[PDB]
Design a protein around this ligand. Structure first.
Ligand SMILES: CC(=O)N[C@H]1[C@H](O[C@@H]2[C@@H](O)[C@H](O)O[C@H](CO)[C@@H]2O)O[C@H](CO)[C@@H](O[C@@H]2O[C@@H](C)[C@@H](O)[C@@H](O)[C@@H]2O)[C@@H]1O[C@@H]1O[C@H](CO)[C@H](O)[C@H](O)[C@H]1O[C@@H]1O[C@@H](C)[C@@H](O)[C@@H](O)[C@@H]1O
Length: 148
């Protein structure tokens, strides 16, 4: 509906889906409150063998082992709950549409995971929702995931 907006960093308001039109094979967005919430979504092109790729995430070079044996894009959610904790692949969205969504609502971050056209929403808790800001690397909309 509203957009597209160009890649930027901002603090999302609550109750609005951010829909990111992923158009490359790297970091799609980085989201943190710098206390209890770090999420980076990495885009993996169809049909790649296991590779150890370097990403610049929150000003640190991180190596992630990624793979994709499918015809679809893989959007890996990498999560850590503190600056000291290791990132881990918390969720994966497997998508032909290349749309990634995030919502702030009810003290939670909501995203889509699983495989289009039956991707479902899931929640992450935070003690500081209001402090979560996001750097979006692709054009985005503010309000589909499964359908385009
Ligand atoms: C159940 C469920 O939802 N399982 C999905 C899993 O984590 C759950 C999350 O809700 C939460 O983060 O953690 C919980 C643990 O306390 C739950 O286990 O998340 C993974 C990662 O996204 C899902 O797997 C991904 O999606 C599937 C489709 C596949 O592409 C995986 O390779 C990919 O990692 C996981 O979904 C289940 O995965 C298994 C096989 O490993 C089956 O495919 C299963 O069909 C699939 O469940 C289906 O997709 C879910 C996203 C959801 O729509 C569920 O209702 C549906 O049955």
């Amino acid at each position: 509906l509203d957009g597209p907006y160009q890649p930027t960093t901002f603090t999302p308001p609550t109750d609005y889906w951010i829909l990111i039109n992923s158009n490359t094979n790297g970091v799609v967005y980085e989201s943190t409150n710098n206390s209890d919430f770090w999420t980076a979504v990495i885009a993996v092109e169809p049909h790649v063998n296991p590779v150890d790729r370097q990403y610049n995430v929150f000003g640190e070079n991180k190596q992630f082992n990624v793979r994709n044996d499918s015809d679809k894009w893989k959007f890996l959610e990498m999560f850590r709950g503190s600056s000291q904790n290791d990132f881990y692949n918390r969720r994966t969205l497997t998508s032909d549409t290349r749309l990634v969504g995030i919502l702030k609502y009810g003290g939670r971050i909501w995203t889509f995971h699983g495989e289009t056209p039956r991707a479902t929403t899931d929640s992450s808790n935070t003690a500081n929702l209001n402090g979560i800001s996001i750097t979006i690397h692709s054009e985005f909309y503010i309000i589909y995931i499964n359908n385009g």
